[PDB]
Design a protein around this ligand. Structure first.
Ligand SMILES: NC(=O)C1=CN([C@@H]2O[C@H](COP(=O)(O)OP(=O)(O)OC[C@H]3O[C@@H](n4cnc5c(N)ncnc54)[C@H](O)[C@@H]3O)[C@@H](O)[C@H]2O)C=CC1
Ligand SMILES: Cc1cc2nc3c(=O)[nH]c(=O)nc-3n(C[C@H](O)[C@H](O)[C@H](O)COP(=O)(O)O)c2cc1C
Ligand code: SF4
Ligand code: SF4
Ligand code: SF4
Ligand code: SF4
Ligand code: FES
Ligand code: FES
Ligand SMILES: [Mg+2]
Lengths: 431, 42, 217, 230, 59, 62
């Protein structure tokens, strides 16, 4: 019914300690409404919690956008003999993305309570939080909050006046972007290299230690208990249909005030930038391009950025995708080819090397891109490069290959004249 | 109220803080499940 | 682009299987807690933390440390070698006292992250991949560190230094040289990634317990 | 009984539950291209050479690892599967060394034959190739690792069949290399078999080096007498 | 382009070009080439026998 | 060179079935030995067994 989105009231945000201006420990969290009626939520049953998540319309906050109630119900099968586990994906490897770091270091008890609520919903015996290895102080804050939760009886033995036993473990990575991929994360937890495994089987059947497992993003887990407390309908009231809720947004690059903010789902990109990030450096006319959802998503130019909304469906219709909602803006005083080439070099340095298309083709893309920045190539190759990206996407084990193919495709599609002009200028300069 | 930043506790975290917290928490855990064997190589 | 670090080990007077490495008793206590974290029958899952612990005790990972971890956890040594060579936070070569990592990925590069790189080079008189003669600093370039909003930034020994200018990085370096530790976080007094002068959210006092609870709960 | 019905290029076949697309195609007489899959090894799914199209499914599946489902129609000779094969062979050949005249696997190479049968006939790779240093694993298996295609057949054989955990992968991405990471001889009573399972000239027989070509040889089927196994 | 008496060539360093791939032996329509090879004392891939029967050769 | 004196050293014949080869050999007066065809037995392959909760099929690397 509502048509205009983007005015989120202060009392309506989920992460009310996003900026760390309040006590991140247990006392402040209870003061702000955390660990309230948690026993009632646990005693209401797993089916009720799953239904609340389903009518909430919550989609996966890792970036894929899969309906979360559907996965958590996939886990809802009867017992087999193996223990059941919840895995929280706190790897946060995507360039431009820092939201999980802020919700982990400043509001850890929301994450812990979400772990408990989700584990109760899916019948898990424990939760493993795979925190990025570089987030050492954030991991220590998480461990201190978990210590407080154990001391207060909120988790562990009986966890409440509930009768449900639940442990929360924190495990640290060691410098691997690929270990954010859920199967690669499970492999890393088991002590092997961070190489993704093929699907099927899905983690709900065979996961960590060979047991049923659900991997969920930090934001999804951390918002689940508030959804249970306030209701699925309250969460579903925000955003368009199939795009419900409030999403954390990271604004970085050529803005006056780069920042992380929580805002309604279907906000316009221009509105978000001009309201929370202070505008693009040099005014809106100075905008050249935006990567709206992290490095994996293709970039879009100013013409489409003018009137585009920030959600999965609208950004898919703009041929990009919402991704992780990491807006990276670039004005007309930057080298767009150089920026895309740097992203491709990042992907070359982050591939695990397991499958030949990603390994070989991403290395090849990196080499071609470096030449492109110089302009050392010829016009005929651009099409060649486009074909190479197509070969990679849809043929690899995991989606890192797609995430390396898409930025190249976006750059070609929206800035072929710039590549052609650079090649022509190089040819003129070198004779 | 909001003017003060209240996450300075990580300013005195040492090289062993995480592992020491893990050791402290080791007494609060539930007994682990077992696969039945000492190792997959057993 | 090209890495520059080899992934084969050749024996060496200061790096060989007889290089003396052992865990301290309290590190053995930490190891036993770490192993207790995982289900019985799956002890290889402790390879990543325990190996990390060895580095925290030693500063880097000799081949003897890898063998010691493999024999403590009763896993084949080749598995520990694969783990050590896969993850980039493990130092298979000795490193300086202050490992300086500069993020140069696109969001950080947009906000002038090479100026801070060259400032560090000029201050230390070393190139990107080397170590100072006194074995006190080691420059290196890394990918996105998860603080893109506070760009440009560096990481030194578990600490994040954010919102940097070349003057700020010079003061951080000479404060490290003095002997004391500079405080982590962003510079310019921005306090963990809010708008610099905007303050466009979370201004009203947060609501208390049970503010918007539904009926029947 | 419990058999399910699937289709290979429209032809019906009944298979046991859990049967892979590759095995269903085998039951019809079609051999799917492969590099990393082996019948007696565990499934890997690395080389992506077995990618095949399922009717009315937008994404290709890895035939060696994906169990077939009831009603599926596998399109082995479809345009999408042919293009997938061509792309995977292009990626495999991008960094491969031009070693065929000096490679001992010249006339009996699965890489060569599958390139002629399923790949393109030309290259559009205009860069320099990677080169890795050779490892020494004993006087029986000669190692030239620039020819390696990272199928991990040798690692799986050594771990599962031979019961020796000496082989692994070190590194990441493009410079991930198969080896031991230390100077170590791979010695076992079954060590020479990794020469046969290696699809390329990366692992060869050292005493056999440069003596013959596979098309010259005459084959006599006989019995070993070095023990009582026969 | 004239085809006359056969010859074996070498690099400017004096090292012989033949590396015993046996492609010429495989392609010879008259089966006039006989080749035997082994590793050299320096590990090089070289021939120990390279015979051409000129009364079988069709040039 | 390698010299031979038997004219049938390079003679190899192709047949659709074993019965055809037996008929040809019998009508041509040659004593024969027939070996039955060896066929690879069907194998049970499961990618999920690579990551096993409690079996020995769990792999240490992939
Ligand atoms: N948060 C971060 O730092 C990063 C996020 N990403 C984002 O991750 C996205 C791609 O991730 P993927 O997991 O590969 O996408 P995906 O669609 O394959 O998986 C989505 C989730 O839903 C589950 N799922 C999907 N289909 C299922 C089915 N048929 N049955 C059972 N479960 C099913 C999956 O197990 C998975 O957990 C990308 O769009 C990217 O933007 C990428 C890099 C970093
Ligand atoms: C290469 C790669 C890296 C990823 N990194 C992360 C990550 O760091 N954090 C995350 O939450 N999801 C990451 N994902 C997506 C995960 O698959 C996702 O967490 C999983 O689908 C569950 O997330 P959900 O809670 O949104 O459903 C990554 C995916 C890929 C392909
Ligand atoms: S796509 Fe890249 S990162 Fe993903 S499994 Fe394949 S090689 Fe590894
Ligand atoms: S392995 Fe095969 S394709 Fe590669 S050089 Fe040897 S014969 Fe040629
Ligand atoms: S050496 Fe041969 S068998 Fe081993 S991974 Fe390389 S190509 Fe495969
Ligand atoms: S064997 Fe024949 S084709 Fe091969 S290199 Fe020697 S002369 Fe040339
Ligand atoms: S790009 Fe530098 S922290 Fe992410
Ligand atoms: S044969 Fe299936 S991926 Fe290699
Ligand atoms: Mg071989």
């Amino acid at each position: 019914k509502k048509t205009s989105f983007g005015s989120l009231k202060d009392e309506d945000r989920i992460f009310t300690n996003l900026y760390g201006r309040h006590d991140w420990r247990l006392k402040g969290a209870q003061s702000r409404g955390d660990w309230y009626k948690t026993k009632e939520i646990l005693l209401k049953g797993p089916d009720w919690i799953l239904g609340e998540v389903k009518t909430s319309g919550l989609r996966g906050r890792g970036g894929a956008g899969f309906p979360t109630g559907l996965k958590w119900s996939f886990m809802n099968k009867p017992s087999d003999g193996r223990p059941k586990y919840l895995v929280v994906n706190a790897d946060e490897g995507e360039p431009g993305t820092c939201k999980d770091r802020e919700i982990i270091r400043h509001d850890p008890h929301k994450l812990v309570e979400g772990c408990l609520v989700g584990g109760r919903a899916m019948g898990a015996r424990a939760a493993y939080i795979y925190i990025r290895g570089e987030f050492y102080n954030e991991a220590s804050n998480l461990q201190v909050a978990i210590r407080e939760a154990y001391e207060a009886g909120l988790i562990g033995k009986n966890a409440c006046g509930s009768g449900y036993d639940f442990d929360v473990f924190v495990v640290r990575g060691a410098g691997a972007y690929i270990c954010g991929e859920e199967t690669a994360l499970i492999e890393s937890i088991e002590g092997k290299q961070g190489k993704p495994r093929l699907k099927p089987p899905f983690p709900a059947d065979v996961g960590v230690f060979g047991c049923p497992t659900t991997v969920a993003n930090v934001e999804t887990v951390a918002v689940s208990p508030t959804i249970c407390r306030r209701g699925g309908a309250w969460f579903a009231s925000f955003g368009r249909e199939r795009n419900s809720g409030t999403k954390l947004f990271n604004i970085s690059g050529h803005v006056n005030h780069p920042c992380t903010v929580e805002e309604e789902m279907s906000v316009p990109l221009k509105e978000l930038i001009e309201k929370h990030a202070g505008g693009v450096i040099g005014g809106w006319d100075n905008l050249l391009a935006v990567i709206p959802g992290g490095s994996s998503t293709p970039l879009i130019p100013k013409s489409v950025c003018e009137t585009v909304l920030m959600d999965f469906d609208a950004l898919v219709q703009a041929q990009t995708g919402l991704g992780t909602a990491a807006v990276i803006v670039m004005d007309r005083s930057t080298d767009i080819v150089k920026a895309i080439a740097r992203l491709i070099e990042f992907y070359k340095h982050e591939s695990c090397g397991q499958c030949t298309p990603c390994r070989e083709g991403v290395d090849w893309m990196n080499k071609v891109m470096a030449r492109f920045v110089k302009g050392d190539a010829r016009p005929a190759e651009i099409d060649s490069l486009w074909e190479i990206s197509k070969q990679i996407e849809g043929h690899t084990i995991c989606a890192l290959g797609d995430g390396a193919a898409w930025p190249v495709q976006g750059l070609i599609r929206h800035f072929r004249p710039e590549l052609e002009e650079r090649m022509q200028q190089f040819a003129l300069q070198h004779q | 109220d909001n003017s003060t930043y209240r996450n300075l506790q990580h300013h005195e975290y040492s090289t062993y803080t995480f592992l020491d917290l893990n050791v402290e928490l080791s007494k609060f855990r539930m007994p682990q499940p077992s696969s039945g064997r000492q190792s997959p190589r057993h | 682009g090209a890495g520059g670090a080899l992934f084969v080990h050749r024996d060496t007077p200061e790096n060989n299987p007889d290089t003396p490495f052992d865990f301290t008793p309290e590190n053995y206590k930490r190891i036993e807690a770490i192993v207790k974290n995982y289900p019985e029958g799956h002890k290889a899952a402790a390879v990543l933390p325990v190996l990390d612990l060895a580095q925290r005790q030693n500063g880097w990972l000799p081949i003897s440390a890898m063998n010691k971890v493999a024999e403590i956890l009763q896993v084949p040594p080749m598995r520990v070698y694969e783990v050590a060579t896969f993850y980039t936070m493990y130092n298979r070569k000795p490193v300086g006292k202050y490992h300086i990592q500069v993020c140069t990925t696109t969001p950080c590069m947009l906000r002038n992250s090479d100026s801070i790189l060259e400032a560090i080079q000029k201050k230390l008189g070393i190139k990107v991949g080397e170590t100072t003669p006194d074995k006190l600093f080691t420059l290196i370039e890394v990918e996105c560190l998860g603080a893109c909003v506070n760009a440009p930034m560096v990481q030194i020994n578990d600490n994040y230094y954010e919102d940097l200018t070349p003057k700020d990085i010079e003061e951080i370096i000479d404060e490290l040289k003095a002997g004391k530790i500079p405080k982590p976080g962003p510079r310019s007094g921005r306090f963990s990634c809010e708008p610099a002068g905007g303050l466009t959210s979370l201004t009203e006092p947060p609501k208390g317990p049970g503010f918007g609870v539904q009926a029947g709960l | 009984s419990n058999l399910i019905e699937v289709f290979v290029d429209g032809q019906s076949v009944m298979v046991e539950p859990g049967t892979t697309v590759l095995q269903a195609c085998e039951k019809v007489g079609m051999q799917i291209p492969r590099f990393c899959y082996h019948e007696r090894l565990s499934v890997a799914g690395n080389c992506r050479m077995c990618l095949v199209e399922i009717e009315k499914a937008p994404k290709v599946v890895a035939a060696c690892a994906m169990p077939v489902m009831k009603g599926w129609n596998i399109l082995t000779n479809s345009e999408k599967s042919k293009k997938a094969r061509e792309g995977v062979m292009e990626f495999l050949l991008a960094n491969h060394p031009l070693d065929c005249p000096i490679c001992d696997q010249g006339g009996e190479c699965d890489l060569q034959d599958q390139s002629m049968m399923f790949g393109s006939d030309r290259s559009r790779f205009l860069e320099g190739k990677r080169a890795v240093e050779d490892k020494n694993i004993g006087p029986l298996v000669k190692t030239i690792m620039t020819r390696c295609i990272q199928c991990t057949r040798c690692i799986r054989f050594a771990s599962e069949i031979a019961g020796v955990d000496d082989l692994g992968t070190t590194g990441r991405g493009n410079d991930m290399q198969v080896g031991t990471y230390i100077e170590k001889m791979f010695m076992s009573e079954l060590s020479g078999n990794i020469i046969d399972i290696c699809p390329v000239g990366a692992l060869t027989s050292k005493p056999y080096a440069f003596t013959a070509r596979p098309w010259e040889t005459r084959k006599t089927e006989s019995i070993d007498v070095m023990d009582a196994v026969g | 382009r004239f085809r006359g008496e056969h010859a074996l060539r070498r690099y400017p360093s004096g090292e012989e070009r033949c590396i015993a791939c046996k492609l010429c032996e495989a392609v010879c329509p008259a089966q006039a080439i006989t080749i035997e090879a082994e590793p050299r004392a320096d590990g090089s891939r070289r021939t120990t026998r390279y015979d051409i029967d000129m009364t079988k050769c069709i040039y | 060179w390698s010299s031979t004196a038997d004219p049938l050293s390079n003679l190899v014949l192709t047949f659709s079935t074993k019965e055809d080869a037996v008929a040809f050999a019998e009508k041509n007066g040659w004593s024969f030995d027939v070996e039955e065809r060896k066929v690879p037995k069907p194998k049970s392959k499961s990618y999920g067994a690579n990551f096993s909760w409690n079996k020995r099929t769990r792999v240490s690397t992939k």
